[PDB]
Write an enzyme that holds these catalytic residues in place. Structure first.
Site, PDB file in Angstrom:
ATOM      1  CB  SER A  34      68.400 -62.172  30.365  1.00 54.99           C
ATOM      2  OG  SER A  34      67.016 -62.395  30.239  1.00 54.99           O
TER       3      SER A  34
HETATM    4  C1  LIG Z   1      72.477 -54.001  38.139  1.00 52.59           C
HETATM    5  C2  LIG Z   1      71.905 -54.779  39.306  1.00 52.59           C
HETATM    6  N1  LIG Z   1      70.752 -55.568  38.843  1.00 52.59           N
HETATM    7  C3  LIG Z   1      69.572 -54.805  38.396  1.00 52.59           C
HETATM    8  C4  LIG Z   1      68.241 -55.587  38.547  1.00 52.59           C
HETATM    9  N2  LIG Z   1      68.374 -57.026  38.202  1.00 52.59           N
HETATM   10  C5  LIG Z   1      67.200 -57.713  37.710  1.00 52.59           C
HETATM   11  O1  LIG Z   1      66.158 -57.099  37.571  1.00 52.59           O
HETATM   12  N3  LIG Z   1      67.267 -59.111  37.384  1.00 52.59           N
HETATM   13  C6  LIG Z   1      66.105 -59.798  36.887  1.00 52.59           C
HETATM   14  C7  LIG Z   1      66.508 -61.110  36.297  1.00 52.59           C
HETATM   15  O2  LIG Z   1      67.576 -61.614  36.588  1.00 52.59           O
HETATM   16  N4  LIG Z   1      65.580 -61.722  35.378  1.00 52.59           N
HETATM   17  C8  LIG Z   1      65.856 -62.980  34.798  1.00 52.59           C
HETATM   18  C9  LIG Z   1      66.433 -62.808  33.428  1.00 52.59           C
HETATM   19  O3  LIG Z   1      65.977 -61.972  32.592  1.00 52.59           O
HETATM   20  O4  LIG Z   1      67.423 -63.548  33.137  1.00 52.59           O
HETATM   21  C10 LIG Z   1      64.582 -63.811  34.796  1.00 52.59           C
HETATM   22  N5  LIG Z   1      63.687 -63.588  33.681  1.00 52.59           N
HETATM   23  C11 LIG Z   1      62.829 -64.799  33.562  1.00 52.59           C
HETATM   24  C12 LIG Z   1      61.953 -64.691  32.343  1.00 52.59           C
HETATM   25  O5  LIG Z   1      62.246 -63.911  31.402  1.00 52.59           O
HETATM   26  O6  LIG Z   1      60.913 -65.409  32.281  1.00 52.59           O
HETATM   27  C13 LIG Z   1      63.673 -66.074  33.666  1.00 52.59           C
HETATM   28  C14 LIG Z   1      64.199 -66.508  32.343  1.00 52.59           C
HETATM   29  C15 LIG Z   1      62.865 -67.215  34.324  1.00 52.59           C
HETATM   30  S1  LIG Z   1      65.015 -65.538  34.711  1.00 52.59           S
HETATM   31  C16 LIG Z   1      65.063 -60.081  37.923  1.00 52.59           C
HETATM   32  C17 LIG Z   1      65.429 -60.567  39.180  1.00 52.59           C
HETATM   33  C18 LIG Z   1      64.439 -60.833  40.141  1.00 52.59           C
HETATM   34  C19 LIG Z   1      63.079 -60.608  39.845  1.00 52.59           C
HETATM   35  C20 LIG Z   1      62.710 -60.107  38.593  1.00 52.59           C
HETATM   36  C21 LIG Z   1      63.702 -59.842  37.628  1.00 52.59           C
HETATM   37  C22 LIG Z   1      69.632 -57.692  38.341  1.00 52.59           C
HETATM   38  O7  LIG Z   1      69.758 -58.871  38.066  1.00 52.59           O
HETATM   39  C23 LIG Z   1      70.789 -56.990  38.811  1.00 52.59           C
HETATM   40  O8  LIG Z   1      71.792 -57.635  39.135  1.00 52.59           O
END
Ligand SMILES: CCN1CCN(C(=O)N[C@@H](C(=O)N[C@H](C(=O)O)[C@H]2N[C@@H](C(=O)O)C(C)(C)S2)c2ccccc2)C(=O)C1=O
Ligand SMILES: [Cl-]
Ligand SMILES: [Cl-]
Length: 520
Positions: A244
């Site tokens: 992100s």
């Molecule tokens: C291509 C397919 N594929 C690959 C893998 N994958 C992800 O590894 N996703 C991340 C994700 O979504 N991280 C979020 C982000 O940065 O937005 C979180 N980061 C936090 C923070 O920085 O504190 C927050 C702002 C509170 S939200 C995830 C999901 C669940 C647990 C940990 C990390 C996908 O999503 C995805 O579809």
């Protein structure tokens, strides 16, 4: 009786930080050598000599006797010039000295990855020592010495070629910032029980790399038990999916498309989005709809994905390419990776979405910092430099001043707004940035790991006139959480505070300024 030629060691060039602090220095040392043929006629002096070299009496004697027929052996290398003349003061027949150099790294592990080191033959094998080896290397000289039949030196005849020293090199690094960054990254690694990490600090106006530190690290002055993994300048040579942390660039593409404006609202309910067989998921799901700023604050993968479907992958690809993601930095650091910005002839929805929220592309920490610097520098990108810059280089306007201004404001809110990344707040300053968390790629198969993570934070400060950009990456935290906003954000806070103070940047947020700043 004959004339022999003897090498005259040359001074390797001094490497310094941007203000002249020594990072690699050729220091004078004294090697002692002996003519065994002469030593064999003064056996009675051996025990005294052996003791003055800290060697066992019999072992020393065995050495000389086994080399009795030779005219030259080393006794000991790398003595201080004062110790060498202490032994020569004993006037033992057959014992001689020569002045040599030892490469010394005064900051040691603190800047090991950037600076690198030279090997036993004075060749740069890692880091800057390798990259600028021709610049830094001296050319050794040569002189003639007259020896008699028993190899006894009776006259220095002449110098046939003078030694020429290598040239000084001033890096872009501010050693003060490097120490701060090194210490704070180390603390964060240990508090979080992480396996590795990187931290980069960049001057957004000049393109200079002010600090670049990684864990694990090593001591270049003592490499006895060095393991390969600790030698990696991960900030330059390791790539990762930025997740992100690239949403601000997707957002910049949206704002530049003419199709989106900050007040627009995107429906993200129920925090998932199905696209064929793939499911895009939001981590936090306490909102049915979000404005553009809210997509960044809540870090909605669903939100940014819908925007991406509307504007197309090409516009996003284009912004990312222009800010330098997946592009050659031009630095020429040994082992440095370009990474990968995918390019398809036709972009399916899956690839379009994942690009927009930072998967399917690979970047380095240096590139990520460089892209944030362009955003911070009102949309103007300047080339990266790992050497001191005298004149501000001409930049390229890669994002419009208006769009960069709007995205800067959004990222200030990501840090400062309710529900934001509050641990990234910098006391005394307005800061802006974006946290991220990525699941690590599976070992031994395709896909992503269930319980292993990379924690990210990228940002810049101060918001009113950005001076520095910073990227923090922590690999596999395991002890106190894993989300970027929990793990990497507080490192940004502490290092940014320190860096801004060290560079005398005046506080622009006096309500939160500490007691020490409210007077200056
Ligand atoms: C291509 C397919 N594929 C690959 C893998 N994958 C992800 O590894 N996703 C991340 C994700 O979504 N991280 C979020 C982000 O940065 O937005 C979180 N980061 C936090 C923070 O920085 O504190 C927050 C702002 C509170 S939200 C995830 C999901 C669940 C647990 C940990 C990390 C996908 O999503 C995805 O579809
Ligand atoms: Cl693997
Ligand atoms: Cl796992």
């Amino acid at each position: 009786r004959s004339v022999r030629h003897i090498a005259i060691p040359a001074h390797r060039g001094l490497i310094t930080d941007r203000n002249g602090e020594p990072l690699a220095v050729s220091t004078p040392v004294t090697t002692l050598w002996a003519n065994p043929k002469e030593l064999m006629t003064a056996k009675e002096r051996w025990p005294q000599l052996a003791a003055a070299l800290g060697q066992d009496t019999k072992l020393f004697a065995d050495r000389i006797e086994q080399n009795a027929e030779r005219e030259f052996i080393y006794l000991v290398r790398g003595l201080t010039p004062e110790q060498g003349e202490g032994v020569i003061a004993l006037k033992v027949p057959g014992v001689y000295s020569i002045e040599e150099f030892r490469r010394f790294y005064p900051a040691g592990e603190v800047v090991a990855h950037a600076v690198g080191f030279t090997d036993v033959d004075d060749r740069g094998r890692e880091g800057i020592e390798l990259a600028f080896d021709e610049w830094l290397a001296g050319v050794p000289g040569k002189r003639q010495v007259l020896k008699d039949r028993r190899g006894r030196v009776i006259k220095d005849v002449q110098v046939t070629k003078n030694a020429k020293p290598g040239k000084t090199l001033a890096l872009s690094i501010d050693l003060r910032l490097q120490y701060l960054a090194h210490r704070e990254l180390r603390n964060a690694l240990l508090e979080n029980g992480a396996k590795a990490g990187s931290l980069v600090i960049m001057d957004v106006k000049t393109g200079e790399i002010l600090a670049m530190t990684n864990q694990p690290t090593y001591n270049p002055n003592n490499r006895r038990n060095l393991q390969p993994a600790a030698m990696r300048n991960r900030a330059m040579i390791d790539v990762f999916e930025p997740g992100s942390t690239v949403k601000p660039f997707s957002m910049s593409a949206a704002l530049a498309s003419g199709r989106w404006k900050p007040s627009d609202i995107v429906d993200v309910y129920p925090g998932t989005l199905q696209i064929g067989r793939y499911t895009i998921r939001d981590v936090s799901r306490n909102s049915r709809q979000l404005d553009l700023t809210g997509i960044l604050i809540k870090s909605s993968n669903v939100g940014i994905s819908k925007i991406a479907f509307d504007i197309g992958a090409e516009s996003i690809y284009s912004v990312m390419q222009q800010v330098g993601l997946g592009q050659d930095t031009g630095l020429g650091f040994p082992g440095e990776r370009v990474g990968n910005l995918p390019n398809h002839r036709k972009w399916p929805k899956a690839e379009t979405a994942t690009l927009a929220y930072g998967y399917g592309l690979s970047v380095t920490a240096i590139q990520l910092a460089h892209a944030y610097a362009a955003l911070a520098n009102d949309g103007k990108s300047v080339p990266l430099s790992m050497t001191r810059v005298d004149r501000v280089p001409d930049g390229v306007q890669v994002i419009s001043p208006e769009v960069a201004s709007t995205v800067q404001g959004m990222l200030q809110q990501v840090v400062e707004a309710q529900g934001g990344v509050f641990r990234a707040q910098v006391p005394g300053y307005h800061a802006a940035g974006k946290s991220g968390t990525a699941r690590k790629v599976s070992v031994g198969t395709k896909g992503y790991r269930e319980n292993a993570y990379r924690s990210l934070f990228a940002g810049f400060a101060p918001a009113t006139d950005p001076r520095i950009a910073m990227v923090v990456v922590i690999d596999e935290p395991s002890k106190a959480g894993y989300f970027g906003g929990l793990v990497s954000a507080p490192v940004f806070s502490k290092v940014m505070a320190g860096a801004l103070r060290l560079m005398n940047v005046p506080p622009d947020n006096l309500p939160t300024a500490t007691e020490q700043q409210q007077v200056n």
